[PDB]
């Protein structure tokens, strides 16, 4: 039972080139396919089923069952929810069902906090998945969406390419995409993005990635660790090294995510838009992690500004966006784990963002200030440009380096 998948062979997912050989085959036929307006659900789902398994049957190889366990948990509270609402639409009954299908998931991020140890309930995709789940909780409630079959639901939930950490879609589009098949030029447009995509990935993630990664930072880190204290020269260069690994592997990932998913016929959304020429805070959220960004700023910030609206909880409009701010970005923080380091790197982005809102709604007043003054509008050129620029890339850094967690290294090993 257990013992069959781990004598199955494990393939990471876009883990060499040669893993394209594999999925490329596999996908090929679809692909042909989508030029006759045709698919072919069975063949769709075996080979989803597949690269799938052959990502979860590791040396743990138990997180199938894991896999398993979470599809029917999940299959339960949406219909449970989708039966309900149809009759009885009630605030407590939604956020029951809420925590429950987010419950596999506080169990995994808050199981190593306690004991020490991965939850049981753990598989690969798990974090992302959520989002799928969620998501639909949420547009159920209001009302936005109402018939679903279990395949369609089960389509989206577990969509293969964008399965292990891929881009996080919503219910609603991705149904829509798929529905209807892009004629034929429109379809072979999209092939060409794919290899141009593909191309671009083995650079960052085979080539780039692989020099910051484990040419650059090993020896920064053992550097930095030798010489001590609270910072140092060395902890510098970990910090902007690090970043630009963190950038070009996940960036990679998303972009042979991006273009799998487009030998599936469906455009999946996008997750990086040159982040780091990026001005402002505000701009680098519209330009990193983007799926995930705006995920958490219509269903969690946004959420919560319109609670904060409907009792008016707060005195002033700024001070209602500044807690859901660092609310809003401590919960991301959250959802990367819980250690210091996961929370610190969420309320940096919280405080982070409220300076920026902050000198923005000041700059408007200098400007109106200015003009029944009669003078100039403030500055606004290349130079103020590069200066914004250099302000939120070394933000944006130091964030990262919280982060990474080497500070945990570089302060506590003691």
């Keep these: 039972m257990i013992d069959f998948l781990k004598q199955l062979p494990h393939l990471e997912p876009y883990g060499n080139p040669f893993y394209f050989i594999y999925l490329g085959i596999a996908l090929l036929p679809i692909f042909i396919g989508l030029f006759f307006k045709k698919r072919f659900a069975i063949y769709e789902c075996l080979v989803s089923i597949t690269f799938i398994v052959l990502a979860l049957t590791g040396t743990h190889a138990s997180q199938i069952l894991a896999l398993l366990f979470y599809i029917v948990w999940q299959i339960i509270w949406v219909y449970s929810y989708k039966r309900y609402r149809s009759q009885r639409d009630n605030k407590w009954v939604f956020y029951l069902h809420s925590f429950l299908v987010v419950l596999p998931l506080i169990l995994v991020k808050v199981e190593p906090t306690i004991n020490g140890t991965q939850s ?10 959520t989002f799928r789940a969620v998501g639909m909780i949420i547009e159920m409630r209001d009302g936005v ?9 089960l389509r989206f939930m577990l969509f293969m390419p964008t399965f292990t950490s891929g881009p996080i879609d919503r219910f609603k589009r991705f149904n829509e995409d798929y529905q209807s098949i892009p004629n034929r030029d429109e379809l072979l447009n999209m092939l060409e993005q794919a290899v141009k995509y593909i191309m671009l990935g083995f650079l960052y993630k085979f080539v780039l990635a692989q020099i910051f990664g484990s040419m650059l930072l090993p ?10 204290g609270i910072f140092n020269l060395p902890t510098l260069g970990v910090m902007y090294v690090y970043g630009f690994d963190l950038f070009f592997d996940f960036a990679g990932y998303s972009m042979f995510a991006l273009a799998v998913s487009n030998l599936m016929g469906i455009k999946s959304p996008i997750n990086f838009d ?36 409907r009792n008016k909880v707060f005195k002033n409009r700024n001070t209602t966006s500044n807690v859901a701010y660092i609310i809003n970005m401590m919960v991301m923080g959250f959802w990367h784990g819980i250690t210091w380091y996961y929370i610190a790197y969420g309320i940096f982005h919280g405080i982070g963002l409220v300076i920026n809102d902050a000198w923005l709604r000041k700059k408007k007043t200098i400007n109106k200030d200015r003009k029944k003054a009669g003078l100039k509008p403030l500055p606004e050129n290349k130079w103020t440009k590069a ?3 250099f302000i939120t890339f070394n933000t944006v850094m130091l964030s990262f380096l919280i982060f990474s967690g080497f500070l945990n290294d570089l302060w506590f090993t003691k």
């Design 274 to 309: 040159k982040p780091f020429i990026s001005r402002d805070m505000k701009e680098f959220w519209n330009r990193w992690h983007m799926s995930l960004s705006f995920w958490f700023r219509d269903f969690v910030f946004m959420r919560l500004v319109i609670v904060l609206m």
């Design 120 to 129: 049981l309930l753990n598989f690969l995709g798990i974090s992302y998945l």
């Design 387 to 389: 200066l914004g620029i």
């Design 145 to 153: 969406l109402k018939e679903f079959t279990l395949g369609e639901f």
């Design 219 to 228: 020896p920064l880190k053992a550097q930095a660790l030798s010489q001590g």
